[PDB]
Symmetry: D3
Subunit: 187 residues, 6 copies
C-alpha cells in the first residue's frame, strides 16, 4: 500500500522512450499515492499528458527540485528509466539535473530512491557505478538483467513490470528479490 | 600575510547564498590581497564584487585557462563549494569557470582552499570529500555537521575561518582542527 | 533494548589496547544481551572476556563463518577498529576472524557497528571510512580528531557512545551527531 | 579448442568446497588440455595432483615463473572466494593463486573466474564489476544462488566453466554472463 | 590495413587547437578508411575532407551503435574533462556518446590524451581506462616536466600506428614515452 | 643535504632483490644521514645492512610503530616497492613492518619516497599508482616501461635516481621528469 505516500517520479534520457512507464504512474495514483513528476528538461506531448494524469506541474528545474528536501519531502523517489549517464552522475553525487537534485533531496532525509536501470554499458564502465549504488544506504533497484546478450553484451535493463512491487518493498526498507534476473526472456 | 598574494575567489551554486562571502572579499582586500573573482555562471552584486576587487569576474572556462600560464594565483578559494562542484572537482572535471580556475592552480602546485557545503557529505559525497582531503595542494576550511537531526548527512564549513585557512594554506599547512562541531557556530 | 539480542564483539590491533572496552562489554551483558567475543588473534584479556561473557572467543575464520547461517548476530560490533582492518572491511577482505564475522553479519542484512581508531583517518584511509559510512547496514560510533596538532590526520571514536550507537543501529539508524570534537573528550 | 592448451587451475577458500569442481577439472583434461593446479596452500591436494599429472604450485615463488619462463594459455580460478576476488581486483599477490593470475595478465593472457561470495551485491560488488570491465578477465556466468536466504550472494554456474574457457581463449566473454543461478541448484 | 574500415573521429576542447590532427584525418582517408567526424560542438573543411556530416548531437551519435557501427572510434585531442567523463561512463556530448556506442559492440576506442592534471587528480581516471576492455592510448608522456609538472600529452604523430594496432586488439608499445623530447 | 636527516629504508618482495640497493644505503650514509632499515620479513645479506648502518632492522609491525611518536623520520624510502606492497599502501593497509613505517611517517606529514617495480603497473595496479602520485607527502623515483614488448604492463623506477628523489622530497618537491623511458637505462 502506497496509499497516502508521496512518491516522486523522474524521467531521464530520450523524450519518446518513456511510453512504457505511463501505466506505472497510472497504477501508482490508482493505488492511492500522490505522485510528483520530475523531468530533466525545462511540443512535448508525452509531458503534456503526464501533468494531466496526476495533479501536479512537472518540476523541471534544479531550484524547483530543492524544496523536496525540506518543504515537500517524498516518501520515495523513483527514477525510471535511469540512463547510463544519470546513473553515473547519481553514483558520483552530481546534481546538474532536476531529477538528480530530487534524488539527492530524498537521500537527504534518509528516504528511499528506486532506480530502474537501462544502459548498454552496465557490464562495462558503468558496472562500478551500478554496484556502488546497490551497496548504498536507502537505494533500491527494480530487478534487472541482460536484455540482449548477443546484440548488446554489456547491456542491462530493469523489468519495469516489477516497479510497483519494488516501490512497495523499498517503502519498508527492503530490496525486492530476486534483484538479478534473466531479463532477456521477458522481452 | 595575505598581503600582496594573488587570490582567486570562486563561488558555485545559488546566488542568494553568497552574502556569506561578500564580506570575505572585503576582508581579503583590506588585508592587502589582490582578489580575482571567478563565477561559475556567465545579478548586479557582480558589478559590486567587480568594484570591490577591481577586476572583472572570470565567467568562462576560456577566461579561466590563463590562470595557469599567464596570471598564476598564489591561492584559489572556492566558497561556497556545492556538492555538485565538489564531486566534479574530485573527479577532475572542468565544465565551469571555477573548476577550470581550480585546475589551472593545481597545475602549478599551488594551494586550493575549499569551503564545503552539501547535504550529502556523509552520504554519497563522502568519498569525494576524503579524496580531496588526501590530495596534494588541497585544503579545507574547517567543517562539520550543521544540522545533525534535520540534515543528518550534511556538512558545511565555518566560513568565518576562511581567511585563517588560506593563511595556513599559503604555507602549505592545513588549519587545525579541521573537523568540528559546525552546529555550535550557527548564530554569529 | 539490548535485551534478548545476540551481539557480536570483535577486537583488532594490539592486545594492550583493550582495557578501555572491557567495561563496555559488561554494560552490554548487564543490559540483557548475549555477547559473542571474536578475536583477530588465535594473559587474562582473553580468559577474562570469556569469563565475563558466557562464551569461548571465536578465533578462527572457520570459527566465524557460522555467524552466517547457524548463530546469526542481531548486531556486530568492532571496537577498536584499526586502520588496517577498516581498509580491509571496506574492501570486502576477510583474512581475519573479526572481518569474517562482520561479513557473516552483513550477509543477513544485520547492522555492524564500528569504532574507528586510526592516525590516517583523514589521509589515505579517509575514502575507506566514507565508503563504509555510505554503506547499507554499517554504523559508526561518533568520532573525530583526537589530537589535531600532534596527530593531524588522526580520528578516534568516543568509546563512551558505544552502547547508544548499537541501540540506534538495532533500529536501522545512525546515532547523531556522528562527527564530533573528539579532542574535548580526552 | 581446448586440445593442447595449458590451463592453470587455482583453488581458493576452504578445501572442502573443491569436490564440486573436480568433474569440470576432469572435463578439461578429457578435452585435451593440460591442467596445472595451483593451491592457496593434504588428501584432497594429492587427488588433484593425481587427476592432473602435475604437482600443484603452492608457493608465491613457484608461481612467479608462470610469467617469464612457463606461461599458461589461460588461468582459471574456481572457486573464487570474496576475499581473493577483492585482493585480485586490487592487485595484491600474497598467495600462489593470485601471483599466478598476475603472471598470466602479465602476458595479456586470459584469466577466468568462477565467483562464490555472499557479499557480491554488497561491498564486493564494486570489485566484481572492476574485474568484469578489465582487459583479459572473464567470468563464468553467475547470479544469485539464494535470493531470500542470502540476498547479496552470487555464485557461478560451474557447468559452464569449459564453455567460458573456450570463449576466453578467443578473447571473448561467454554470453549471457548474468544468469538466474538459483534456478539451477 | 585501414583499408575498408569505418573510423570515427571525435574532437574535444578548444576550437583552434585542431591544426595538429587535421593532416591525420587525411592520412586515414589516404589509407582507405571511411571517417566519421564527431564534434563536442574548420568544421566544414573536415566535412569536405571526409565526405560526411559532423555528428553534432547526442541523438546523432546513438546510431553509431546499432546502425552504423564503427570499427574504431578515435578521440583526439582528449581533454582532461572528457577523459574523466569517459572513465566515469558519462555521455553528455556527441563524442562521449560515440565512444559508448562503440564499446557497446566490443570495438576499439583510441585515445590521445592531453591534460595538465594527468599526474594529478586525473591520474586515476587515465589508469582506469588503460586497464579497461577495448581502450587504447596513443603513446604519451610529460610534455613539459618543469613548466607543467602534472601534464601529459600524446604523440599525435603516432595516431595511425595506434589505430592500426587497436584494430588488431593490440596496444602500441611503448605507450609511456618522453613526450618532452619530441615537443 | 641528507646530512643530519633520519631516513627510513624499507625493503619489500624477494630476498635476492637487493644486489641493487646496497650502494644506496652506502651513498645515503656517506652523505651524512642516519639510515633506519626496515624489512618486510622478521644468506645474511641483511646482517650487512644492519652492519653498514648502526641499527638493527625493524622487522615487526610493533618495532615500526615507534617511527611515529618516538623516532620520527625525515623521510621514509621504500625500494623496491612491489606491486603487492604498492596496492596495500595505496589502500592504507599496514600488515607489514614496512607499510606500518610508511604510515607512521605520513602520520607526521613527512615524505615517503617510492621506487615502483611491478609488471601490472599499467594493468590493475595503475589506479593505485596514480592514487599515490596524487596523495600528500608521497613522491616517486622516476619510472617508466622497462620492457615494452616483453612486459607491456611493467613499470620500474630508475634506481640510479633514488638519492636525487629523496633530496627533492625533503624539500616537499617531486623530482622531474617523473615519467621516463626506463627501457633506455638498462645498461
Amino acid at each position: 500500500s502506497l496509499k497516502g505516500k508521496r512518491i516522486g517520479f523522474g524521467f531521464t534520457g530520450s523524450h519518446c522512450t518513456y511510453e512504457e512507464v505511463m501505466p506505472h504512474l497510472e497504477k501508482l495514483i490508482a493505488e492511492g499515492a500522490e505522485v510528483r513528476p520530475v523531468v530533466s528538461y525545462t511540443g512535448a506531448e508525452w509531458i503534456k499528458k503526464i501533468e494531466e494524469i496526476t495533479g501536479f506541474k512537472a518540476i523541471n528545474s534544479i531550484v524547483g527540485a530543492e524544496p523536496l528536501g525540506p518543504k515537500i519531502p517524498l516518501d520515495c523517489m523513483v527514477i525510471a528509466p535511469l540512463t547510463g549517464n544519470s546513473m553515473s552522475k547519481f553514483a558520483n553525487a552530481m546534481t546538474d539535473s532536476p531529477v538528480l537534485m530530487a534524488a539527492k533531496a530524498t537521500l537527504r532525509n534518509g528516504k528511499p530512491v528506486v532506480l530502474a536501470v537501462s544502459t548498454n554499458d552496465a557490464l562495462g564502465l558503468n558496472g562500478v557505478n551500478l554496484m556502488r549504488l546497490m551497496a548504498t544506504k536507502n537505494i533500491y533497484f527494480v530487478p534487472f538483467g541482460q536484455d540482449a546478450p548477443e546484440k548488446k553484451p554489456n547491456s542491462m535493463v530493469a523489468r519495469m513490470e516489477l516497479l510497483e512491487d519494488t516501490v512497495l518493498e523499498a517503502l519498508q526498507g527492503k530490496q525486492l528479490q530476486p534483484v538479478v534476473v534473466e531479463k532477456f526472456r521477458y522481452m
